């Protein structure tokens, strides 16, 4: 966000964009497999 290169920061956010979607399903798969 801050500092020079405003696009550079947004370019990195790309990977994070889907990352947030992976961290959700990931934990969902781990818990399930954990079973009761």
């Amino acid at each position: 966000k801050k500092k020079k290169d405003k696009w550079a920061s947004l370019w990195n956010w790309f990977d994070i964009t889907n990352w947030l979607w992976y961290i959700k399903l990931f934990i969902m798969i781990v818990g399930k497999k954990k079973k009761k």
Side-chain angles (χ1 to χ4, degrees):
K1 269 286 195 177
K2 312 292 209 245
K3 230 86 141 97
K4 262 195 111 165
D5 298 55
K6 232 296 295 243
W7 56 86
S9 339
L10 201 151
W11 185 100
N12 189 288
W13 192 83
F14 194 67
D15 189 76
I16 290 79
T17 328
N18 221 96
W19 189 48
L20 257 93
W21 240 103
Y22 172 89
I23 61 172
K24 286 177 178 144
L25 51 93
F26 172 57
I27 302 296
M28 188 215 101
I29 302 134
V30 181
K32 284 284 148 253
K33 295 287 232 197
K34 210 71 233 223
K35 267 279 212 103
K36 279 203 126 165

